[PDB]
Structure 1
Amino acid sequence: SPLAAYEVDDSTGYLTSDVGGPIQDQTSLKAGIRGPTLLEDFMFRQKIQHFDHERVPERAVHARGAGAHGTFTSYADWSNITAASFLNATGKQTPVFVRFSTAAGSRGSADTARDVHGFATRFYTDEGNFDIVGNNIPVFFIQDAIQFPDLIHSVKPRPDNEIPQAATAHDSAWDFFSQQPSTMHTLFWAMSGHGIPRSYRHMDGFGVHTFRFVKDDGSSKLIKWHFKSRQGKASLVWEEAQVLSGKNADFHRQDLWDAIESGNGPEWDVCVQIVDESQAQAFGFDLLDPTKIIPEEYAPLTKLGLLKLDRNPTNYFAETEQVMFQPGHIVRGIDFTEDPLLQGRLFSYLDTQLNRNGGPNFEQLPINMPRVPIHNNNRDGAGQMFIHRNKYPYTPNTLNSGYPRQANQNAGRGFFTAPGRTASGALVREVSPTFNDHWSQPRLFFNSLTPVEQQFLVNAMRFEISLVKSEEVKKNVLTQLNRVSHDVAVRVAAAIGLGAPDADDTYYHNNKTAGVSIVGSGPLPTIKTLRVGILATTSESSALDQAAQLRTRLEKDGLVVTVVAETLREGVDQTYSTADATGFDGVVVVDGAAALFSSPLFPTGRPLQIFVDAYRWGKPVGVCGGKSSEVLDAADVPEDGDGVYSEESVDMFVEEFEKGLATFRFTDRFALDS
């Protein structure tokens, strides 16, 4: 355990104050048995003061989130492309901590809000902490860090009433999007299934920005980070995400926790696209522009190593809440580029920790500490935990023999700015005209989605735009969408009873790019951890027998089985009253239970509703035992439908059903615009 040294055990012993005096904490000291409480009660005041000051400010963005520890392992010695120590040998291992998050919502908002998602990774390297502060979407809304508060104010709740929570579905957000067309690319990503991932484990991570890899000889190359999930890509459908938000606000954090606890820690290949400095404007856009991806067709991925998360935190506040990432945590071998979005982030993440931590010594929190010695002349500040021996903390000095020594390209493995970097020209507050095409790449993205995937996106837009009250804003939205795709503008316009403006083909094209579609990404490469709900009954001892046999067979392949019945007993995990289709990736009814499909024990129609919801949301569904038509007919589920199963044999049922879990969603169950 990485932070063992800082752990506090309270599995034995007597209660003490923070200064080690044994005390009690259950009754206040009073003047008489029915008397007033005394000011001299220090036991009361120390305990309540602590409680009164437990909270710290939530993160200004990405407030809602969850973390875990793991390991990164290098696949090679990468000295040919970078000086980075953590990448300098085959099999070299570095501890990591990753936090995943939504972006807009406060603490306590729902995991399954439609949003961009954070994917922030710390590498505790032998040459310092290196953070990659990424998202699950490869492009960002805006092209200059200075616009960040405008973006965030617009998508956060309206500031008179603080409504709506964790949602872009309101006037101000769509007003900003329509007035600031740079937003289109990330908007199209967020309106796709990427806005509602099935789990943190089923999404990728992106650094977003172009960075540099820098070799010990000072030469550099431009890179993009892509963490490719070994679990596959998967999304919720919108209606499902909505119900989930209410039934289980903690869905993603629970999923991550459970996967780690079961020995199924999630994995990513940590990859880069690498290109030459000379290619900054070779691909049809500017590599300094964070609203653009490099299509995989122009630059393939190099797999650098393996990321695995395999240990849950011990105390969430101490580790997950207090972790303070910074793109300023950089190491020798890596450098920045002149992406004006990146440039401004460097400032913000150092400054914002003062707010969260309330003092300048936030790097001393166990979770933020490096795993190597610290030698500098930083001193004092509130919460100072070190006792510095060096009483001459200035450079240059002779009284401490010139120590600490300066580190740079030539001595002490110092960080150094890529020495080939230059600047030229007037000092300006001007936008590069190379940043000006806001629409071709959103269109490239939309073109790369399958037909049913494009429908889902259009439906997300119809959902949100329909909730915009201002007809002017709605009209301005259609103006921007129409620049990406006339068809999209027409189909969205239809839901809101406006007309799309006439086609404007300046940025239309039919090009496609690999690796961005969820629905087209193939069956999941593993079904371990997926959830199967077996709907059963206590009326029939045969229903519970089938359920037990099924459980045994599914659990063997690492599926997480929940048997549902009217009441709990041995072998039944959940009651119908607490069960919901959003709790499962697949739903099986045992034919012993056919009769269920009114009780004081659950709402009217609940068992059927679970099956029907599962079907409507595209999940694999079936009946096990041999008698199926009663259940399937009651549900209106066709017996020959794709992803609908019926077998007497447990072994045979499970083999078919398991293919359906891998396929994950049966998209033919969703209507398309004609």
Structure 2
Amino acid sequence: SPLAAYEVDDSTGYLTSDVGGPIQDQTSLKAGIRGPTLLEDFMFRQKIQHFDHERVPERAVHARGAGAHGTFTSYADWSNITAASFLNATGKQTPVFVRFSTVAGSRGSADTARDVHGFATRFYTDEGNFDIVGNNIPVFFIQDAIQFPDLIHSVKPRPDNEIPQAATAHDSAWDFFSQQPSTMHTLFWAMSGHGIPRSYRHMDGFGVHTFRFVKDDGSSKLIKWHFKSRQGKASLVWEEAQVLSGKNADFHRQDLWDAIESGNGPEWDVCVQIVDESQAQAFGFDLLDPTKIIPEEYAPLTKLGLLKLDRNPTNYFAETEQVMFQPGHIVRGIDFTEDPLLQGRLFSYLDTQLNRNGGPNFEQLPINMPRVPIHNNNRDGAGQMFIHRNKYPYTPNTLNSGYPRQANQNAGRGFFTAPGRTASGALVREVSPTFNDHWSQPRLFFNSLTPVEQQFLVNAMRFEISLVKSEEVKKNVLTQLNRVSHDVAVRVAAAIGLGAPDADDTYYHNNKTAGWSIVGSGPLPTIKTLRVGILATTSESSALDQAAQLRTRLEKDGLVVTVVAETLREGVDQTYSTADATGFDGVVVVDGAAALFASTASSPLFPTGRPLQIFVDAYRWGKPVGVCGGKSSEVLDAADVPEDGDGVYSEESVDMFVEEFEKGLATFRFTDRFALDS
């Protein structure tokens, strides 16, 4: 472990206090065997005091998340574009820590809520910690950081009763969206499959803001960060996400942990779009505007290196809960832009750690420490762990010989502000007119989805907006949607029994761009780690033998196989009672188990109809399903599943079955099973 120096081992030895005195901790000291507990019981108090103070404030946003360690490897010497030391040589390795998250939910809320997702990466570089604090969606709801509490109050639970948890499906959120049109772009992304990703591994990371790369000669270029998943992009469907939020609140964190433990640690290409300073307004919008994306057709990705997560934490609290990211953790070679959303973030992340940590020495927590020496005149504060030998911590000094020395552009590899940056004009609390088109890019995004994806997005909006109580807010929502697409407004209006306003075509267009569509990103590049549930029975020795044979053939290709039956025994992982279609990417029934597949099928060991429900749920949610053994028409008829269907498999031969089935797992979702408007 990168944090091995801090680890404490308790695999041997006797219980001690925190000051090393051996003690016991199982019975209170009392005045007699049936007597009251004594104040002088220090063993009791030290233990309970610690317990009583275990909690810390959850993060103000992105409270629900999980993390892992890894390594970043540069693909080249990037000195041609940046002074950044972690990018300065082919093959240069830097340790990382990544945390993924939702936004709105509190720390025990479900992973599979519909939400924007955090993707926060720390690079522990040889010139200091560098953090890229990104999301899985490339654009943000608002154009100025000062609005962040308004956005967050609106999407978080209503503050009288704190309902609803981890959801935008309430009046306040849609009130805000409808009144603040900047929100439309991120809203469309959140309402697409990007709002309910299959896993953290199957989503991308984006810095969102324009940043600068600064060379050692002082020249700069404008960049956007894109972390492109090597596992491919995949989404849940909403009805699946909802059940999964109940069956397994921990789904995304379990998925990540398991992938790492099995040697399938996720990878991303760390990429940038790079453009000249002179192109700040060349693409038909302002690069300072965090509601806008540069189409890849206008500015291609450069792959900088590989991010791989391959080690799980030892202690969640100490590593994942305490990691304290900051966009202020910047290194020489990177600089900010005048994005008013970014500008205000720089304040927030330094301040909020005082809340979380309760003290100013939060950079001394192991997970937060850098991997190079610290030389500065910061001193004291609660929880101060260092013992500083320099007794003249001021500049300028002679009594410590002028140390520490100042670092800048020309000495000490100092950070420096890009020297071509300037400001001009009045000191204003005014929005740039260049930010005023809130609707064209939401339309570009909608236009770039496939027909079934467009339907899923409409369906997400119909779901959420149908739960808004205020008729005025609903009308206001359709007004805003209508500015993006008349068709969207019509289709959503139909579900909520309002009429859509007349078409307003000011921002309508038919342009499209590549790389935003989930459904359109073709088969997954790997099916390693995908989950196959094999539904079997203990009532037939032949069913368990078919299940074992399938297990062997599927595990050979790196699939995670679960054999399901009525009761556990050797070879059976899970009972029907605990099994659900949300647990699998594909479902196979062995044809020795066909008798379980009545909807009438009843047992004290699982809920009525459970075996068939798992198969039917899997089919309805677009998953590859099949029967293995040659006799398929009893199972398929019970389930109302057509044998001829795409992503439906039946074969006697285990080998032929698995070859077909694995193409289905790569396809991932069979979208022909979903009805479309008109």
TM-score w.r.t. length of structure 1: 1.00
Q: What displacement does 1:459 show?
A: 0.1
Q: What displacement does 1:466 show?
A: 0.1
Q: What displacement does 1:316 show?
A: 0.0
1:609 aligned residue (591, 613, 620): 613
Deviations 1:556-605 (A, max 9, x none): 00000000000000000000000000000000000000000010000000
Deviations 1:382-419 (A, max 9, x none): 00000000000000000000000000000000000000
SS of equivalent residue, structure 2 residue 332? coil
Q: What displacement does 1:645 show?
A: 0.1
Deviations 1:73-114 (A, max 9, x none): 000000000000000000000000000000000010000000
Residues in 2 aligned to 1:495 and 1:419: alpha-carbon distance in whole angstroms: 55
Match of 1:659 in 2: 663
Q: Which residues in structure 2 correspond to 1:250-329 (within 5 Å)?
A: 250-329=250-329
Match of 1:144 in 2: 144
Match of 1:573 in 2: 573
Deviations 1:462-515 (A, max 9, x none): 000000000000000000000000000000000000000000000000000000
SS of equivalent residue, structure 1 residue 123? strand
Q: What displacement does 1:258 show?
A: 0.2
Deviations 1:275-294 (A, max 9, x none): 00000000000000000000
Residues in 2 aligned to 1:663 and 1:369: alpha-carbon distance in whole angstroms: 43
Residues in 2 aligned to 1:199 and 1:573: alpha-carbon distance in whole angstroms: 22
Q: What displacement does 1:185 show?
A: 0.1
User: Aligned residues, how many?
Assistant: 674
Q: Which residues in structure 2 correspond to 1:127-276 (within 5 Å)?
A: 127-276=127-276
1:631 aligned residue (635, 640, 650): 635
Match of 1:334 in 2: 334
Q: What displacement does 1:328 show?
A: 0.1
Q: What displacement does 1:534 show?
A: 0.1
Residues in 1 aligned to 2:31 and 2:244: alpha-carbon distance in whole angstroms: 52
Q: What displacement does 1:220 show?
A: 0.1
SS of equivalent residue, structure 1 residue 652? helix
Deviations 1:342-392 (A, max 9, x none): 000000000000000000000000000000000000000000000000000
SS of equivalent residue, structure 1 residue 115? coil
SS of equivalent residue, structure 1 residue 506? coil
Residues in 2 aligned to 1:118 and 1:295: alpha-carbon distance in whole angstroms: 22
Q: What displacement does 1:314 show?
A: 0.2
Q: What displacement does 1:241 show?
A: 0.1
Match of 2:531 in 1: 531
Displacement over 2 Å in runs of 4+ = none
Q: What displacement does 1:641 show?
A: 0.1
Residues in 1 aligned to 2:474 and 2:612: alpha-carbon distance in whole angstroms: 39
Residues in 2 aligned to 1:294 and 1:55: alpha-carbon distance in whole angstroms: 42
SS of equivalent residue, structure 1 residue 120? strand
Residues in 2 aligned to 1:75 and 1:668: alpha-carbon distance in whole angstroms: 40
Q: What displacement does 1:128 show?
A: 0.1
Q: What displacement does 1:187 show?
A: 0.1
Residues in 1 aligned to 2:674 and 2:170: alpha-carbon distance in whole angstroms: 26
Q: What displacement does 1:198 show?
A: 0.1
Q: What displacement does 1:146 show?
A: 0.1
Residues in 2 aligned to 1:160 and 1:648: alpha-carbon distance in whole angstroms: 60
SS of equivalent residue, structure 1 residue 507? coil
Q: What displacement does 1:609 show?
A: 0.1
Residues in 1 aligned to 2:655 and 2:103: alpha-carbon distance in whole angstroms: 44
Match of 1:490 in 2: 490
Residues in 2 aligned to 1:200 and 1:233: alpha-carbon distance in whole angstroms: 10
Deviations 1:45-96 (A, max 9, x none): 0000000000000000000000000000000000000000000000000000
Residues in 2 aligned to 1:673 and 1:52: alpha-carbon distance in whole angstroms: 55
Residues in 2 aligned to 1:251 and 1:656: alpha-carbon distance in whole angstroms: 27
Residues in 2 aligned to 1:578 and 1:229: alpha-carbon distance in whole angstroms: 31
Match of 2:436 in 1: 436
Q: What displacement does 1:259 show?
A: 0.1
Q: What displacement does 1:260 show?
A: 0.1
Q: What displacement does 1:41 show?
A: 0.1
Residues in 1 aligned to 2:107 and 2:286: alpha-carbon distance in whole angstroms: 36
Deviations 1:160-189 (A, max 9, x none): 000000000000000000000000000000
Residues in 2 aligned to 1:565 and 1:660: alpha-carbon distance in whole angstroms: 24
Residues in 1 aligned to 2:412 and 2:313: alpha-carbon distance in whole angstroms: 34
SS of equivalent residue, structure 2 residue 367? coil
Deviations 1:599-651 (A, max 9, x none): 00000000000000000000000000000000000000000000000000000
Q: What displacement does 1:331 show?
A: 0.1
SS of equivalent residue, structure 1 residue 631? helix
Residues in 2 aligned to 1:9 and 1:626: alpha-carbon distance in whole angstroms: 55
Residues in 2 aligned to 1:517 and 1:340: alpha-carbon distance in whole angstroms: 29
Percent identity between matched residues is 100
SS of equivalent residue, structure 2 residue 392? coil
SS of equivalent residue, structure 2 residue 506? helix
Deviations 1:1-34 (A, max 9, x none): 1000000000000000000000000000000000
Q: What displacement does 1:330 show?
A: 0.1
Deviations 1:400-450 (A, max 9, x none): 000000000000000000000000000000000000000000000000000
Residues in 2 aligned to 1:513 and 1:388: alpha-carbon distance in whole angstroms: 56
Residues in 2 aligned to 1:76 and 1:434: alpha-carbon distance in whole angstroms: 36
Deviations 1:292-332 (A, max 9, x none): 00010100000000000000000000000000000000000
Residues in 2 aligned to 1:102 and 1:360: alpha-carbon distance in whole angstroms: 27
Structure 1 spans left out of the alignment, 5+ residues: none
SS of equivalent residue, structure 1 residue 655? helix
Q: What displacement does 1:339 show?
A: 0.0
SS of equivalent residue, structure 2 residue 264? coil
Residues in 2 aligned to 1:619 and 1:482: alpha-carbon distance in whole angstroms: 34
Residues in 2 aligned to 1:303 and 1:108: alpha-carbon distance in whole angstroms: 36
Q: What displacement does 1:532 show?
A: 0.1
Residues in 2 aligned to 1:247 and 1:109: alpha-carbon distance in whole angstroms: 13
- RMSD, matched Cα: 0.2
TM-score w.r.t. length of structure 2: 0.99
Structure 2 spans left out of the alignment, 5+ residues: none
Residues in 2 aligned to 1:264 and 1:652: alpha-carbon distance in whole angstroms: 26
Deviations 1:125-164 (A, max 9, x none): 0000000000000000000000000000000000000000
Q: What displacement does 1:271 show?
A: 0.1
Deviations 1:184-232 (A, max 9, x none): 0000000000000000000000000000000000000000000000000
Residues in 1 aligned to 2:592 and 2:453: alpha-carbon distance in whole angstroms: 38
Residues in 1 aligned to 2:570 and 2:305: alpha-carbon distance in whole angstroms: 45
SS of equivalent residue, structure 2 residue 213? strand
Q: What displacement does 1:248 show?
A: 0.1
Residues in 1 aligned to 2:52 and 2:111: alpha-carbon distance in whole angstroms: 27
Residues in 2 aligned to 1:107 and 1:74: alpha-carbon distance in whole angstroms: 34
